[PDB]
Structure 1
Amino acid sequence: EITCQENLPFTCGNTDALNSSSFSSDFIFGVASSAYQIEGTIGRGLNIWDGFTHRYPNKSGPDHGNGDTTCDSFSYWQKDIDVLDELNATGYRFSIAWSRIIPRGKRSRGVNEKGIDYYHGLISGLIKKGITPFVTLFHWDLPQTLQDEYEGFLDPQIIDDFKDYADLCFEEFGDSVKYWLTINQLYSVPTRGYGSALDAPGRCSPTVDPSCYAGNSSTEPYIVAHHQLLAHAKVVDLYRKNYTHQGGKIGPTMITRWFLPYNDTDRHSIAATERMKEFFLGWFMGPLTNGTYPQIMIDTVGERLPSFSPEESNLVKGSYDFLGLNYYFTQYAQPSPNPVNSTNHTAMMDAGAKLTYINASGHYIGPLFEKDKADSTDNIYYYPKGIYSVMDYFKNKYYNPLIYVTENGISTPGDENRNQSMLDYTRIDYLCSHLCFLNKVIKEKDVNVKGYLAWALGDNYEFNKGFTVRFGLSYIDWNNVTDRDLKKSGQWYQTFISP
């Protein structure tokens, strides 16, 4: 019988008690990255994260940081491989920058051979060290040209441009890459990119944020989400019809959270909690498992919710071999009004829920996850049991899928000096406590989880935060980015992997 801790102090950093041998022999352990966050702009065209961070520097991070140079994995990809080799990792998730291989967006405009060569060399280097690549086609970095031609995922033109990009990736890299992710965190671009305008491309209703160049936060999230699902599904169909000889697997990436009632004896909070599951997870998992959006979304969102045709429904339903599930934290849910006629209405209001990290009796859900220095009542707290609850829910609700945990990690402040930054015991605690619950759910609930990739390989540009936080298991000096030095967490993870 497995017992796992939910509160500080944690004792799962002892590899005598928790290590890779606790999991099945074939289980993959590694780390993750994304292209905007690590590569730099050298050698690629411009994408909407370049555009957004440059047009709206205060939205890029408090330091106005961006991905222009970052950790320079364009130059230092071998050093990334070296970290993975030091870890004895068996997996690495990275993304392909669309703008590096097709700078002009549309494949018929030509490819960048040198960009293709960059990923060939990375892939070959990984495989030579026994590391399985997990490759994200689209980690938010849409070529700027496509956003300017037709507003990107706002328009159905995205589907064929994404398909042709993906086809090039399968053609060039699929002989070696056997695990593909289509779109990173399906929920995020619709809501943050087109709802709150916290993320690229930065569209919203005028009264939500007067700096947005255009948008409608009530309608566009739904349009974009719908196009994401269709573009994803078209790529999965292309993969499974035209690249079956490659013997690989493909799936989407979800951001997952668990949700608990703010007041577990209040029917209204219980209802809000179940609505959140539907609106947060079901928005995408309903289509992916059934070809339809959840009924509560149909009912609430009404004419703002697009319909799938019968052909589209069939294309989207079942459009995965596995799910990449990202998991960071859990929220309490309580009811909230949905003012659909307000000029500041957002899609996110349609769930009719307010989310907190403290429940009605004043209980904080778990240890600190992210401090918010401008408003401490907005601090985020984590909840290790949430990974158990999410995986159990996916198994039970969503037809026992094959799952890889494609991100899980925690930040430390960029204000810490290097010695403090390397002494990242809070990261060991977060990672181990989640791994304990992941082992527990696999054993107790028989969830088909076959790997775990911690966020992040190394310090990088963090969307929305610049270089003001660090997520890496290895440390990068922003004054001299060449080295990636394993932190205490990376050293712990090395021991966990090879105990």
Structure 2
Amino acid sequence: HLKPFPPEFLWGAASAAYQVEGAWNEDGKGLSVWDVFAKQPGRTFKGTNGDVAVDHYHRYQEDVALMAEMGLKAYRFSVSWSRVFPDGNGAVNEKGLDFYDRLIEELRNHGIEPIVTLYHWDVPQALMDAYGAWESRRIIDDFDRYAVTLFQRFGDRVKYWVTLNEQNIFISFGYRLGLHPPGVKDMKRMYEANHIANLANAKVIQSFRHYVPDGKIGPSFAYSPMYPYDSRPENVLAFENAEEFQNHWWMDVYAWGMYPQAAWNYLESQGLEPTVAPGDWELLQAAKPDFMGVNYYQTTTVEHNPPDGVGEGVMNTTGKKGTSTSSGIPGLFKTVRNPHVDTTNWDWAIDPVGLRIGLRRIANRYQLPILITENGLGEFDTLEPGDIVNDDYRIDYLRRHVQEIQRAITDGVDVLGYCAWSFTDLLSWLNGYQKRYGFVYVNRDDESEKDLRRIKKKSFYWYQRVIETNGAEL
């Protein structure tokens, strides 16, 4: 006997500002780091960018009407920092606040609960220009200022907030792999920026306790649960190293205010540990979140890796299956293909049991409620004559993950809600428009902008059915 989904379970879907909004220079909006970065040659798939994206800024009324038709209980979206503070720092742009106020109003008028992500990777370029953005403690005061603005403005209508979206991704990709702005490959700077982001997250959770006393806040972590390749002790040890370095390094800070000691000692042995200042620990430890947000797509299997072994690997940005290669930390661990799971055309593992495992690990270790703020299947879709998108692959992916969530709930994990990625098709940062996640197909590709018309996929109706029955029918 499975527990039922709780009565007010947030059946949701999600987007991110730069990926959907467009209107990149309208109504006072300032330059963001992604405005700049995406226009640099070779940074994105086929030079795609979010100048227009899917034009959600102008079509939000249509999109919300499709959410209402779907029956969504919740919609997760991010506020574009550069829309609200074009300089990051100076005067509020009221036109920018007015759009999100219009959007929230529309959501509530249709009975949809808004989930607002404060930061989804688009720090204003002015802050990067002024002081290096996440590499400077000044961004703590500046990020706080921007969040308190949003708290005061919308605290009365938005109950659920996410602080930083996938801090582990935009810090690592932006400062170690050089695939995100600022395009740096410097492990020392990476950990300094990561430590500052940790302090920013804690500071605004504290501010949230004052300005929105009845609300619920937490970060959203990009969680890939690690697996050992097999029962060889050296591979299990590699799994221990990988889970602590890739996952506990962030989630222990979110939940306990402390870095894990083995990873710290390893970084300290190389001078790579972050600069701690007086008060940092007191701040980090005095900022408990209401939940752990989890973005989940896949697990990662690892094995032992010699000190001279694999480092950076190839990542599949083209959808040509089988082109990614193993990556790792020399001496600690390396990724390896898990022969027991299928993979997508971008080589992502399809592992719905991995989601239950991951939910269990977080409940077991931190004792916190979980909001699944992203989960979904990115794949090619074909538009058929008659406005038919038969995305059975995506229905099956989502069905199996939702089934594992109910088993995790039965196991005692307190799951607050589930936000599928994504509501409409949107621009994938590094993969372009062909890597589609939406319940709603958007009519454009990487060559032609066409008309951006929305078309309901087969998965739209499946998920509408799920929400209708509170998950009882999948």
TM-score, with structure 1 as normaliser: 0.85
1:29 alignment partner in structure 2:
11
2:432 to 466, 469, 483: 466
Match of 2:319 in 1: none
Residue of structure 2 aligned with 1:47, choices 32, 36, 43: 32
Map 1:50-65 onto structure 2 (within 5 A).
50-55=35-40, 57-61=41-45, 63-65=46-48
Q: How many residues align?
A: 444
Alignment correspondent of 1:434: 401
Q: Counterpart in 2 of 1:140? A: 121
Structure 1's 335 and 450: CA in aligned 2 closer, same or farther, altered over 3 A?
A: same
1:112 equivalenced with 2:82 (yes/no): no
Change (3 A) 1:83 1:231: same
Which stretch shows the higher mean deviation, 482-491 or 422-431? 482-491
Counterpart of 1:366 (choices 311, 330, 341) is 341
1:23, 1:439 within 8 Å by CA — same for their partners in 2?
yes
Deviation track 1:54-86 (CA, whole Å, cap 9, x = no partner) reads 12x32211x211111011011001122112101
Q: What residue is the counterpart of 1:306 in the other structure? A: 274
Q: Per-residue displacement from partner, 1:95-123 (whole Å, max 9, x unpaired)?
A: 000011111110xx211111111000100
Match of 1:390 in 2: 358
**Shift in Å, 1:258:** 1.4
Task: For residue 482 of structure 1, report the CA deviation from its aligned partner.
Answer: 4.9
Taking the aligned partners of 1:154 and 1:177, their CA distance within structure 2 comes to: 30
Q: Is the 8 A contact 2:255 2:289 kept in 1?
A: no
Q: CA deviation at 1:494?
A: 0.5
SS in 2 for 1:227: helix
In structure 2, runs of 5+ residues without a counterpart are 314-326, 470-474
The structure 2 residue matched to 1:230, chosen from 167, 174, 199, is 199
Residue in 2 that maps onto 1:164: 145
For each residue in 1:19-76, what CA deviation from the matched residue of structure 2 results, as whole angstroms up to 9, or x when unmatched? xx94111111010000000001133211111111112x32211x21111101101100
**SS of structure 1 residue aligned to 2:75:** strand
Q: Which residue of the partner structure matches residue 188 of structure 2?
A: 219
Q: Following TM superposition, by how much is the alpha carbon of 1:485 offset from its aligned partner in structure 2, in angstroms?
A: 2.1
TM-score (norm 2): 0.89
Task: State the SS of the aligned residue for 2:12.
Answer: strand
Q: Structure 1: which 5+ runs fail to align?
A: 3-20, 205-215, 373-378
Structure 1 match to 2:335 = 355
Separation of aligned partners in 2, 1:141 and 1:351: 34
Q: Distance in 2 between matches of 1:388 and 1:92?
A: 23
1:495, 1:180 → 2: CA distance? 27
- Residues 186-220 of structure 1, C-alpha deviation per residue, up to 9 Å, x if partnerless? 2101211111111122111xxxxxxxxxxx2x212
Query: What SS does the aligned partner of 1:253 have?
Result: strand
Deviation at 1:312, TM superposition (A): 1.8
Identity of aligned residues (%): 34
**Which of the numbers 54, 57, 70 marks the counterpart of 2:53?**
70
Cα offset, 1:391, TM superposition: 0.6
* Matching residue of 1:248: 215
Change (3 A) 1:111 1:481: farther
Match of 1:207 in 2: none
In structure 1, the residue matched to 2:171 is 190
C-alpha separation in 2, matches of 1:427 and 1:337: 38
Q: Deviations over 1:313-346 (max 9, x none)?
A: 2222243111111100011111224569x999xx
Structure 1 counterpart of 2:38, one-letter code: T
Letter in structure 1 aligned against 2:343: L
Instruction: Return the offset for 1:483.
Output: 3.4
Q: Tell me, yes or no, if the aligned pair for 2:306 and 2:331 is still in contact at 8 Å.
A: no
Say which SS state the counterpart of residue 485 (structure 1) adopts. strand
RMSD over aligned Cα atoms:
2.2
Letter in 1 for 2:12: G
Q: Distance in 1 between matches of 2:435 and 2:211?
A: 42
Q: 1:427 to 1:285 in 2, by over 3 A?
A: same
What is the SS of the residue equivalent to 1:257? coil
Q: 1:470 to 1:138 in 2, by over 3 A?
A: same
**Does structure 1 conserve the Cα–Cα contact (< 8 Å) formed by 2:308 and 2:331?**
no
Match of 1:476 among 442, 445, 467: 442
Q: Are the aligned partners of 1:190 and 1:220 in contact in 2 as well (CA < 8 Å)?
A: no
Q: Secondary structure at the match of 1:427?
A: helix
Find out whether 1:410 has 2:377 as its counterpart.
yes
Say which SS state the counterpart of residue 293 (structure 1) adopts. coil
1:269-308 aligned within 5 A = 269-302=235-268, 303-306=271-274, 308=276
**Is contact 1:104–1:145 with CA below 8 Å preserved after alignment?**
yes
Instruction: Answer yes or no: is the 8 Å Cα contact 2:441–2:454 preserved in 1.
Output: yes
